[PDB]
Design a protein around this nucleic acid. Structure first.
Length: 119
DNA sequence: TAAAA
């Protein structure tokens, strides 16, 4: 997920070439516990989506014009500061992100019994 | 075409 380049050989190529990462990943799920890592999940930012609270339906209200406008807005914001530092969350946003990632992360059970036994 | 798949 956190790889900036992909150094690999083409399907039938002769030598290994270098491709900068030109894609963004978005994942979809209905499980409430998808983060297997127990020592922090800073890569993945879970957004909980609620039906019947969607003001606009993504089936009939997202049209190429609307997504083009969204990407033009993103282009403006990125061109305000064209560096990777501008892509990080705000301090309070990152603070909430820690709690959200922990809440959606798998919990180890052995820790509880170890604590009880040591107590 | 063989490879590489």
């Amino acid at each position: 997920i956190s790889a900036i380049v992909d150094i690999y050989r083409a399907s039938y190529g002769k030598r290994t070439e270098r491709h900068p990462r030109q894609c963004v990943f978005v994942g979809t799920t209905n499980n409430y516990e998808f983060l297997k890592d127990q020592t922090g999940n800073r890569r993945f930012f879970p957004i909980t989506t609620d039906k019947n609270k969607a003001t606009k339906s993504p089936f009939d209200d997202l049209t190429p014009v609307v997504v083009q406008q969204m990407f033009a807005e993103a282009r403006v914001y990125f061109d305000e500061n064209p560096t990777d530092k501008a892509l990080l969350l705000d301090k309070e946003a990152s603070e909430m992100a820690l709690k959200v990632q922990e809440a959606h992360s798998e919990k180890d059970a052995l820790v509880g019994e170890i604590e009880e036994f040591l107590e």
